[PDB]
Design a binder for these strands. Sequence first.
RNA 1: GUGCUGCUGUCUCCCAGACGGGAGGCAGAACUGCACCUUCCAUCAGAGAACCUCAC
DNA 2: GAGGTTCTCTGATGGAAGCATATCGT
DNA 3: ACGATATG
Length: 831
Amino acid sequence: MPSYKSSRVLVRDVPEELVDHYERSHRVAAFFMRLLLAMRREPYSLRMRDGTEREVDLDETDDFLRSAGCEEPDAVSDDLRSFALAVLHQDNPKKRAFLESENCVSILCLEKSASGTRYYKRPGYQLLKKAIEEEWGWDKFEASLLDERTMEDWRRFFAARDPDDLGRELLKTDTREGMAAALRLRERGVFPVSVPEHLDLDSLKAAMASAAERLKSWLACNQRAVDEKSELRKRFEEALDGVDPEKYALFEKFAAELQQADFRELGFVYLAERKWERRRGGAAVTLCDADDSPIKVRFGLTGRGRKFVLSAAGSRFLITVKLPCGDVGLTAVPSRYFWNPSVGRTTSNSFRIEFTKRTTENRRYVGEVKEIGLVRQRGRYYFFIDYNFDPEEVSDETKVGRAFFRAPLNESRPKPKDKLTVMGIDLGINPAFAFAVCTLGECQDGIRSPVAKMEDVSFDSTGLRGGIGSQKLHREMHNLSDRCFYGARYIRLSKKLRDRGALNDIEARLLEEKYIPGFRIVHIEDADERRRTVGRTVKEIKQEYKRIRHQFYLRYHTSKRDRTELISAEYFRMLFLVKNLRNLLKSWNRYHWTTGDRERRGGNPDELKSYVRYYNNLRMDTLKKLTCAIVRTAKEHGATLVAMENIQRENSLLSLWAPGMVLERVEQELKNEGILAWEVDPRHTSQTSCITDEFGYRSLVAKDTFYFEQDRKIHRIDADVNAAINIARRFLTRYRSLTQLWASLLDDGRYLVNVTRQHERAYLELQTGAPAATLNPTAEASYELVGLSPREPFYRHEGVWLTREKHREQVHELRNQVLALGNAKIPEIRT
RNA sequence: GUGCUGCUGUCUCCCAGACGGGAGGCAGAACUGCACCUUCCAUCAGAGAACCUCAC
DNA sequence: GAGGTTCTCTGATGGAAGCATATCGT
DNA sequence: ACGATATG
């Protein structure tokens, strides 16, 4: 599997011949879609351009196979089935009939084809014989053939040159079943299909590639659906026998009368009947179309399709597709992705393209093009320049570095034995991310961190990135987003003022004490004039939203351009402001939804498409910029190991992205730049000091300052640096210190430690001496680990393992000191 | 190329109706900034909305 | 925050993708 | 040596 990065380039004046080739390629690809399914001789479901699903019967397969050439489709049935499953990759991966699904069209489509009657590349037999007959002594052949075969014919195979004889014997003894089926069909003279449009071999390869890949995907999904339905039915039938008697005949009538109006064993059994029945067993077949579901009309340089000669002049590409009708020259609209490109024909059927994506530096990127693909969108054509790239080299020393620091203490993986650079990364929204960088073998001055089995390290480089660029804009994106949230609730109640009378009691202080101050609307009692007073605010909401979006636009088109950061905390506030504005606009659009009225299958089908498009675009842009700043921060400091918080474990990156796809993108782009990363457990990183390794206070009024005590003097430090170091410190110490153990009580105050994870197993050994331990109580409401010779949270503190009630009070006792003392008398750490 | 990403003027369909909101098209003006692997497909779950029912 | 209702859109979590060599024959 | 197949 090569590495792949891709982009699109526009072509404007497409000649009629290429348009015809495009459409014919889709039509033939649809023909392949249909003919493979027909040869499967298994009925399926076709989803038309509309939502309707059609049950294509066996007759529609039979008559189509009749048209395609098979005048007696039933008589040759098993043989067609075997060929069909071969091109769709339903045979064994080793010794496959067609390693590339395309390679069947020589036998399927042509008229005088020699495919299937060759031995020149038969694996390891003809090549071995041809090699030995030249410069070997007829003795290592025995070793080579015994090695693979662990018969007397092999003696004659090397007794003479006999290439044709061995080829014939291999084609006889070794018959890949998918090709034997095709030869049998062509012997009957029914296999060469009548392709509706006349295309040469190269274009038929390209069509069959896409048709076959669509069939392979759909077949895999169908098999998954069938297997899942079978397994769920197995679970239901296992549960049905169980212990429940035939009394389950009654919950049927019970559910009937319930749904007409609309027990543990009865309810659970009911779910299985409903869950099993509604699940589909088969997927839908979506046939290819020119405009509905386009396929890439691929043009390869080895046989996949018509060859192309990619060139470049100035700041744009020059594509020439060598069609059978003639050479067709296309010029490319210049792309900032492949800006100022240079092209070069290589010695391996490829073009070496060197271009420049970004505009900050002039860094030139190198890739190889080996296939170009053609699609259309909104009647406008495109080529997919799907190129390759070699990722940056990662030292074998980094791999031994990553394995060592990842391992729990009870594993003994080797020391890195070199000077690595480790990174600490926290992730937030206002503080997009913060970092701490340490160098192994070099501790000079800073927050010194233990390193497992090595000397300590000092974090020289520390910083907070992302952040709020302009203070005013961030506050305005927050005032409006608060208003947009509170208007959606307000007009839910507003209608009930007019729809009902005097509302209720639970709402009364919910409307007055919370919603009126929020939506900033004066309350009028007369219903007719409540529509006007609510409409003018929604106008005023848009009128100030447009202002904000325009000032957000001008972050890139003023003299403030130089100060505009790569990523800001405004990227996330805008996303929520777009989100809340969407709900409010949706709610006001249904201000007329009155009495009992519901959303219909029709109505308005394009509602708020501009906002949804802006929502997805802003997110995709935010994550790409977020990854760049992280990777830019990693490369600059010489980092090769990145410790990240496992965020899988409002004001969070969650509710904007899935918990994982954020981390996946960062790791992928780090690995392209030759930087390995690991996910560190993000427990107690924001509540534990990185200096004293003791619990502190995360200030609620100010979420950037973390208070702890050192030498009985209260200190403060940035809570993003504090967590960034605590993520890196955990990695370098191999999670040596834990701050929480789960324990369960059996009797008389002996809380038994629940060992679930291997990190707890190793930890107890370094203190107790056994892979298990107990908590004995002491005089001052504390505990102590003992350890046993062969669930309630507990918090460490000063070697005492206090409980949640007394851990909260210790945190609370420190808060009172902070509030009493004040930030003026609490010194700063970083600088 | 696709986005971040809008402004002015003018024009057409739609939902409310005389408060307002949502799709779009051409026309210029302003701006030389940041980033950018993406195509296709099938299942099964969520978000919020909104109508019928609750006092949390 | 109780509890099916009917629809769009993610969103989940998968699936298939984005070419090599080999020789004959002129 | 390049083209026309063919198949790892």
